[PDB]
């Protein structure tokens, strides 16, 4: 199977490089015009740029020309990016993607985070949210964080009925805050332990919390 | 640039119903050159259907697309539960590739009142000069919904930050978490919390308040 | 949109040796393009041949060879047997001077 594997997403600091690679496989790399692709948290897909199969032709989206360059290594099977003087909006999730023979983008990676911010990698705290017509409402307030993402299980995985994990948003200060809640039988607070496990893979954090009532 | 425009933003119907999207170029687009894309959330978007009658493998019949200059549409033919996500259109005859913004196809129910709750920040947080006020509308539809916030009867501006989930695949409702982030010093010179929603199927807007201190 | 024009059907040779021209026309005035051969197979896809080439210049390919007068390529195919009857698309891109543009002609068809 045609497979499309990019790397080398991550944090950077405005205005400096990074460089993603895209490792492409199952069918001629040689043979095939290539793309990147990228999506900005919450929004929609925006082009960036192509490379023909060979290398001697490529485009570039305005919001990226003179700052990003494209290029391929056809021995290795690989697609880069080299993106130069970086800026907030060039933050989102870039896509690899082959423009198959007849027009569209037939194949598509699974993306790469790139996140553009000043600020440093930080695992959060997590602080929580007690409960008080037989239903409870508790959570976790997984605050100031970064970068993203950010996993959330309750119970250790055992608890997944009721659960709602919403999606980070981002604060004045350049951190990400989001929370965790669960609701469950308002008769069961005083005889189940629930403790959210927050694991934040880019600061190798794990917080276990315990949420207990009144 | 050719800017393709989609309509409508979300799409609400029930499985077994024809679903048309919508997608207009702001330059006639040749009808051969129009392309679809599915996305479902946390995965990259693949190719549907392109072409004037091609389709992309493995994509089904129900999907098909027509139109042509201005105002091109996909029709579902009959909705399966795997096809409630997000359609992006895209031509492809010339440069830049350019996208739709996307419209969502999400699952029509009944309409269900939120369950609410509010929650005062954690002692733990305050110790550390921020107040986090949490208040949580559950498992609701559909998605518009209206939380105001009042300190001791005043409305607050400018200082709450909403989040949404995405639908829930059981129960086909959304649920909403709106935090209200103050200061220690301006959280302790004030009293009554209340959290306040409007929403389709509330007859009366719903308060859930707490004074500060329980 | 942009236009390709291909005949609907060439007759090969008793060598196997099919030709025809393929014209393009569009709203730009391109000086560097990539023509390209397909073969439909069916519901699948396959690069018979592509060049790209500038105008004037040669246009360099292989089992292909083309000329290019103004927007028509001569396209010149060695070589199939009676076994490719089948339909042949022609694909045109212009590259330079931007923007990129695609066409798709409505196909043509060989006989050996
Ligand atoms: C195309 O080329 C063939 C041989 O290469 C020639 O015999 C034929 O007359 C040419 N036709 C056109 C229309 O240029």
């Known amino acids: 199977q045609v497979q499309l594997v990019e790397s080398g997403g991550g944090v950077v600091q405005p205005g400096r490089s990074l460089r993603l690679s895209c490792a492409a496989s199952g069918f001629t790399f040689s043979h095939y015009t290539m793309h990147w692709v990228r999506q900005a948290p919450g929004k929609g897909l925006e082009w960036v740029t192509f490379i023909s199969y060979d290398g001697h032709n490529k485009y570039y989206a305005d919001s990226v020309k003179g700052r990003f360059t494209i290029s391929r290594d056809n021995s290795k099977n690989t697609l880069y990016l080299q993106m130069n003087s970086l800026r907030a909006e060039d933050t989102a999730i870039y896509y690899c993607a082959r423009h ?94 629930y403790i959210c496990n927050v694991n934040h893979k880019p600061s190798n954090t794990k917080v276990d919390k315990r949420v207990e009532p009144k | 640039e050719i800017v393709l425009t989609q309509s409508p933003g979300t799409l609400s119907l029930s499985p077994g119903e024809r679903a048309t999207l919508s997608c207009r170029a702001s330059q006639e687009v040749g009808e051969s050159e129009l392309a679809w894309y599915q ?176 | 949109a942009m236009h390709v024009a291909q005949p609907a059907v060439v007759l090969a040779s008793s060598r196997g040796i099919a030709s025809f021209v393929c014209e393009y026309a569009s709203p730009g005035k391109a000086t560097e393009v990539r023509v390209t051969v397909l073969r439909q197979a069916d519901s699948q896809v396959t690069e018979v041949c592509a060049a790209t080439y500038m105008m004037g210049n040669e246009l360099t390919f292989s089992i292909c060879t083309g000329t290019s007068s103004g927007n028509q390529v001569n396209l010149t195919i060695q070589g199939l047997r009676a076994m490719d009857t089948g339909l042949y698309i022609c694909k045109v891109e212009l590259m330079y001077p931007p923007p990129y543009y695609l066409g798709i002609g409505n196909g043509t068809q060989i006989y050996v």
């Open chain 1, 100 to 193: 198959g023979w007849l027009g569209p983008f037939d194949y598509w990676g699974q993306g790469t985070l790139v996140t553009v911010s000043s600020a440093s990698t930080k695992g959060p705290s997590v602080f929580p949210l007690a409960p008080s017509g037989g239903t409870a409402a508790l959570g976790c307030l997984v605050k100031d964080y970064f970068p993203e993402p950010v996993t959330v299980s309750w119970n250790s995985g055992a608890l997944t009925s009721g659960v709602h994990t919403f999606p980070a948003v981002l604060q004045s200060s350049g951190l990400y805050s989001l929370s965790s809640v669960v609701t469950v039988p308002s008769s069961s607070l005083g005889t189940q332990t």
């Open chain 2, 39 to 214: 996305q479902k959330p946390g995965q990259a978007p693949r190719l549907l259907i392109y072409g004037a009658f091609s389709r992309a493998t493995g994509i089904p019949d129900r999907f098909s697309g027509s139109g042509s200059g201005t105002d091109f549409t996909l029709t579902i033919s009959r909705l399966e539960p795997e096809d409630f996500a997000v359609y992006y259109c895209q031509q492809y005859g010339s440069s830049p590739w350019t996208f739709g913004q996307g419209t969502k196809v999400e699952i029509k129910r009944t309409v269900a009142a939120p369950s609410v709750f509010i929650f005062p920040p954690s002692d733990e947080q305050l110790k550390s000069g921020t107040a986090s006020v949490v208040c949580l509308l559950n498992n609701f539809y559909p998605r518009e919904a209206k939380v105001q916030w009042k300190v001791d009867n005043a409305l607050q501006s400018g200082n709450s930050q909403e989040s949404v989930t995405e639908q829930d695949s059981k129960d086909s409702t959304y649920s909403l978490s709106s935090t209200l982030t103050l200061s220690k010093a301006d959280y302790e010179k004030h009293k009554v919390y209340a959290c306040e929603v409007t929403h389709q199927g509330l007859s009366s807007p719903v308060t859930k308040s707490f004074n500060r201190g329980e």
